[PDB]
Amino acid sequence: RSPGVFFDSDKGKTHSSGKVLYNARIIPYRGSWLDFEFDPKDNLFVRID
Amino acid sequence: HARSTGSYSLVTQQPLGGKAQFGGQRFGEMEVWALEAYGAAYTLQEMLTVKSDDVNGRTKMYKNIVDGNHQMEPGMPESFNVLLKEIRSLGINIELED
Amino acid sequence: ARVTVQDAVEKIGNRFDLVLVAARRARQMQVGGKDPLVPEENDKTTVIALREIEEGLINNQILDVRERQEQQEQEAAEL
Amino acid sequence: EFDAIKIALASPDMIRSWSFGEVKKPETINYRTFKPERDGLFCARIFGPVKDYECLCGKYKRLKHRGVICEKCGVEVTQTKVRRERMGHIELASPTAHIWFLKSLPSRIGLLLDMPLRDIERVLYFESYVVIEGGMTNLERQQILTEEQYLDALEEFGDEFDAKMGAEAIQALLKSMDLEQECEQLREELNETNSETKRKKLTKRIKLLEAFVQSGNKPEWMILTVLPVLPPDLLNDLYRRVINRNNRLKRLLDLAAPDIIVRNEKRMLQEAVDALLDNGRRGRAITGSNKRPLKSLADMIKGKQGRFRQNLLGKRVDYSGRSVITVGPYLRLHQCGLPKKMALELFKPFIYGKLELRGLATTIKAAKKMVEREEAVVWDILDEVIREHPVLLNRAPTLHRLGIQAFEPVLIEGKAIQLHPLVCAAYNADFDGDQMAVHVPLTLEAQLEARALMMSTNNILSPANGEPIIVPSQDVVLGLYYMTRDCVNAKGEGMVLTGPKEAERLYRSGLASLHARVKVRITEYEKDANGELVAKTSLKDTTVGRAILWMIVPKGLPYSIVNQALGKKAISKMLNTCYRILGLKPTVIFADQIMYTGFAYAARSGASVGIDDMVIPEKKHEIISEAEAEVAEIQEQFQSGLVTAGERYNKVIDIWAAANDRVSKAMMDNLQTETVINRDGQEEKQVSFNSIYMMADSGARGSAAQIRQLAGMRGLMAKPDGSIIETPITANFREGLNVLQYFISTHGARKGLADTALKTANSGYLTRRLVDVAQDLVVTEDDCGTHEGIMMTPVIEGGDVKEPLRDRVLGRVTAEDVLKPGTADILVPRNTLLHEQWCDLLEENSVDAVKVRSVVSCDTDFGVCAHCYGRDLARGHIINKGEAIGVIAAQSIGEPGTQLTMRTFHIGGAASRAAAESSIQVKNKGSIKLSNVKSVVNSSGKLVITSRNTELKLIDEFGRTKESYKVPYGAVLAKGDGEQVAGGETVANWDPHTMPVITEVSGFVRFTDMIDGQTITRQTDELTGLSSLVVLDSAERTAGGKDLRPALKIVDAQGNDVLIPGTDMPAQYFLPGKAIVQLEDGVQISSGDTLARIPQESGGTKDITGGLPRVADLFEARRPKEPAILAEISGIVSFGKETKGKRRLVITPVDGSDPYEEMIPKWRQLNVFEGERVERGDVISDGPEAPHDILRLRGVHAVTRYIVNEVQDVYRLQGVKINDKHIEVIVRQMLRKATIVNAGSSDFLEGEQVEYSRVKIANRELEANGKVGATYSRDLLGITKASLATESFISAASFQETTRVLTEAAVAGKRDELRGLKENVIVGRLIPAGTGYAYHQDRMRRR
DNA sequence: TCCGCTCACAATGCCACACGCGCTGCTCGGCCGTAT
DNA sequence: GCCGAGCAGCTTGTGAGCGGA
RNA sequence: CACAUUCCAACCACACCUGGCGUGUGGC
Ligand SMILES: [Mg+2]
Ligand SMILES: [Zn+2]
Ligand SMILES: [Zn+2]
């Protein structure tokens, strides 16, 4: 994956909710990853490594 | 690649593989189930313990074959006794029957 | 050279007891050293066992009574 | 020689006396010396002498001093094998209980002596030890204390207050615990308590303790009173450290050490024994060298490194050759080829024995030298030793029975293994480089078995279906098709012959051609009523090739079978008729000669395809130009602003599809024609003589789609999304494919290739699961002697006939006697085997359904009887007793999984899903039957349906149903009951966009119990004008309207409550939340018409039926995403409190209160209104169902019927024929466990999932008495869970979850009869399935 | 206070890496091998 | 303080929280 | 007196080394 930012969508019937989720993933050439993800609720969450 | 009767591994008293040496072929679980689907209780017992497990059975089987005795020895495996004893020594009675 | 044994399945109830009595007969014949009753073709013991099972002169009950009478006559000769 | 095994605690004193000798000496080995260490780890009095009949010191080797030990050695001269079998004991310092009995989820020490896990741990480990013998203290007899409270109480109680720690503490605790009193106290507490969590905990506790107090166990027996020592051949340094700690104690405790010092010593010895029990479950991580820990009786007994799992079930075998395959066409069917070197190596001891039996080689060394030298004389010995010694050919992936077969080998050259061509199709082994193995029976019994059962000639019917697996392959059928394809003009046109030998002479002489209609004389043999064959001569008018083939077929079959083109289907049905009429004996030689003649005549034919052998249609270019012009016009119409992108896309797609279909039909028509020949005339166009048509139409190798893609345009390709692109491949393989065309082609093909690879890699897991779930059964009893069964009918759901009756019933025994439509006709009585003539009688009698036996109806415990199972599916007779039908069933189910595409485009609603097209159409004419009859004539003279479960079937002109159709919820049908209406037209209708509230009677209606602004709003229609009232739901309503449920009170013409005919209760139509009201109050509502269009979703589609994961989930019975919920109890439905996170609902029947509570998500609508007193087990939310509710609310036959129907639908969608007996026995093994729902006068309660056969045999004793036996309820579960919940622990231990299952097995304390198969493979005993089964019974007659 | 709901394992399951099966010098913890 | 050894430089399911009214 | 373990004509006893594998940790 090219170092940068991508936007993935958990489509289909994932999480048994029938609602597509969205998560932006930032990955450098070498270092610590980063992710900003959604949930069935409207609360945005962050994940590191 | 074919192997009649050769060496055995150090840690395992079972035949080895590899065509470059004197090795047999591996008996996987799918062919176990295929053979169990048929009959061949005797044939399965031969393929399992007389040919690979019983170190004294395969020698005794070869000795019987070379003099014309085409009869198998039952030869309950020693490792079965080893496991039975480990189960008893685990503090749990070996409530075998018959 | 035996190719078809369907008439043997027609003779005995199934193949399990069939191969069992065949194995007992082959043990009593080959590694038993006894004599057969069917003309051979310079072959092994398995196919003549299958042949004599196919004929009908040897089965489970016949083998049982034969070995029983043999044990009885051996005990009688032992006195 | 062993009976069912069992595993529990018993008699530690006998455990002690079973071995002898002490190993107290902490020293590992006196390696510097060579005298027997009387107490060292590598001792002799515990294990034995160093070698067989030799002392340990090496000072005596003969057999004369044997009888008395040496002066200072102590070695008794005997065999060394006892060292591998004798044990002793490590001398102890403190009696320990266990450490492995703690992480068993839950602990096996605390959960037996009313103590929590943490408390027992802190007693055995140095956190807070237990006080015992309190004295005048006010502490309980079995109450744990801590160090601080043991210290502060030591002041008021100086010496009368004592406490022990760890090993001896737990020993004294378990010794002073009389569990029978504790068991009675726990039982009384259970009979007194009333809860859920405590109830479950206490019932698990009381069962676990009753199973112990009933068996030969004891609490103190848990304490390891004596620890045995492990022999040196097998932890060694671990118990070395253990005895070192023991010696440290004995040197630091015998001096009357203080209590703290002896406490530390005994706790260290306890920790050492804990190390012995487990390295990791105790709390310490030892190391051997450079951070490398050692094991404690096991490390990971799973996978490919464990003992009970890997090396005791699967390992390498000697006397096994492996090589490549090659086509041996000349060898006979029963025999096969074998290389010279392979036969020489894999039979060296056989050669040695044959040489020593004669004077060719007396000793073994000279025999080996002569063999390795390979003299020309020994070849006859090798030929004789393989004359009647068959071997076993084995394919690398083995999925069904035929993966291993028996063959008589013949010696040949080349290091390749010649194989019969007519068996590779059964082996699934093409000749592209496949490698296969060969095994030798090595035993007279094994040789006889291989010749008897697994022989090639004894295996021609597939274990899945009665169809012959020995079906001819492409070459022979192509040759025969060319041989019998008669032309119009050839050499010898219209001559006359008198025999097939004359035809052979004419053909081999070159005078007459191969295929030409001629008059010949055929002497056929018709099958008499008895086992005779009446001969009859007849002058037939047939081609020469058919007369040639007639020399091969035996006398039994008539001439009409060979008077065809002899396609693949034709030759397969010919072989089937030969096997059915002539049996098995001549079928083998018939097939062999058929293959011989096919090869010979395909060689003499000269079939070959070239460039000018695939004619391109002249109108193909015209069709393509017209299609592209039409799609260009459609695109211009779209660009002009007349249509949207979706409809023009669909239009282009269907236009291209129609153009491709037309050009393919034109190509296919042009292929057969244009082959005009002059036979004494001008134009005699006939079937084409083209090579590709002879290869395709014959069904040998080519199919219709393949030749269509080759000659005509390829068609339509799609991206991984499945959306068909608008650019179809307008070229063919004969022409050049453009760059983009081939790019799209590989783009679509790589997905299929990856899918095939992943599926063929994944199918092994499902096959293993299906094998392990149903391997513990063998056919033991002959006839269970029962009356239950299942009702079988030809599969007509949807299409005309998906599966007929005969093929679904042929192969079994009818449970109940079949009744002819004529009353009191028992032409098919009870307990009757079926045949082709029998099913012919069933069909001519117009029998609709038959009560056939089943494996579930077989009441035999721990096994199924042969009388209620069916036929053999491999031998045309009744199935016998003993064979493992479960293993063959798992194989036949998991074998064709190689034809299951996971997910390419099959979603179920691919084309469209709408209920407006639900208008029912039919083809046949006859009677019309209706189930759940709710059909009312409305005020408009029409017939409206007031039900959902109503199903309309068409009884044919004889009595059987052919078409079945489901009506939507409240549909309209122009027809009625018993209306003799023709077929070919739609007579129904329905609204998908909503759910009408259509009535049954006339009258008025008003807004009774309604209000605007509280539960209803004010909205107007933007299409007509009249206001559309919106009845609010639980979401968009306030608090003042939460306690209101509006409805519509149907009234008469005057305006009073309706009097429903039949009952006395008025029926008003209840309006749930989020409803639409258009026909408002005070209007003349015409009966049978939509009034309030209540919204409902009609666009949900998640069907994955056309996929392997569907079958996987069916076998796992997993919960779907949106399960089709059912009604638990019957009666009316009452809605109560809601918005407790989601919506809630209550149901109450007429014969009971409402103890059933349920919740429904707000995104799922209802199916029936509140006023409908519906029946339990009815559909509530449309969608996928769950088998659990199906079983527990509809019965046993319904759930298995649904499962079999679904799996048959999947396998017929994938074009796979599988008999239902396998799925029957699998689903039967799936629900082997049940649950009690009423304790009754039995010994068990409702909170115990007892096995079904066990609770049945428990009722066998109470059958003689009047006490109620039990109240079982079947609850099917996941096959992984059903396999883990196996009564046998041996089969369970080696299974997955080895750590969990090993814990649960070795701490259970129960009996397992090993009445299965896996345990015998574990121990190595003969399996009680094949030749050993009866053998086992042979040793069960006396004892 | 019990009831949904989900996370950390436990363990189908495989996979990845460090290394060892045949590196050497340093530093912390425990050391008496026939009438042994 | 003396000898011996390890360590380094190189997908199904369940118990147990965690809200959740 | 007492156990007793012997310096062992043809010849049975003095036969074979090796592969790929394994440990630990981490992952869901
Ligand atoms: Mg291939
Ligand atoms: Zn000695
Ligand atoms: Zn039955």
Swiss-Prot record, chain A:
Subunit description: The RNAP catalytic core consists of 2 alpha, 1 beta, 1 beta' and 1 omega subunit. When a sigma factor is associated with the core the holoenzyme is formed, which can initiate transcription.
Similarity field: Belongs to the RNA polymerase beta chain family.
Annotated signal sequence range: none
Function summary: DNA-dependent RNA polymerase catalyzes the transcription of DNA into RNA using the four ribonucleoside triphosphates as substrates.
Residues of the full protein shown: 151 to 199 of 1342
Name of the gene encoding the protein in the UniProt record: rpoB
Identification of the protein by name: DNA-directed RNA polymerase subunit beta
Swiss-Prot record, chain C:
Keyword Transcription (UniProt): yes
GO biological process: bacterial-type flagellum assembly; bacterial-type flagellum-dependent cell motility; cell motility; cellular response to cell envelope stress; DNA-templated transcription initiation; intracellular iron ion homeostasis; nitrate assimilation; protein-containing complex assembly
Similarity annotation: Belongs to the RNA polymerase subunit omega family.
UniProt-listed NCBIfam families: rpoZ
Organism of this sequence: Escherichia coli (strain K12)
GO cellular component, one term: RNA polymerase complex
Subunit structure: The RNAP catalytic core consists of 2 alpha, 1 beta, 1 beta' and 1 omega subunit. When a sigma factor is associated with the core the holoenzyme is formed, which can initiate transcription. The rRNA transcription and antitermination complex (rrnTAC) consists of RNAP, NusA, NusB, NusE (rpsJ), NusG, SubB, ribosomal protein S4, DNA and precursor rRNA; S4 is more flexible than other subunits.
Annotated function: Promotes RNA polymerase (RNAP) assembly. Latches the N- and C-terminal regions of the beta' subunit thereby facilitating its interaction with the beta and alpha subunits.
Gene behind this protein: rpoZ
Catalytic activity: RNA(n) + a ribonucleoside 5'-triphosphate = RNA(n+1) + diphosphate
PANTHER family: DNA-DIRECTED RNA POLYMERASE SUBUNIT OMEGA (PTHR34476:SF1)
EC number: 2.7.7.6
Sorted UniProt keywords: DNA-directed RNA polymerase, Nucleotidyltransferase, Transcription, Transferase
Protein name: DNA-directed RNA polymerase subunit omega
One GO MF term: DNA binding
Enzyme kind, highest EC tier: transferase
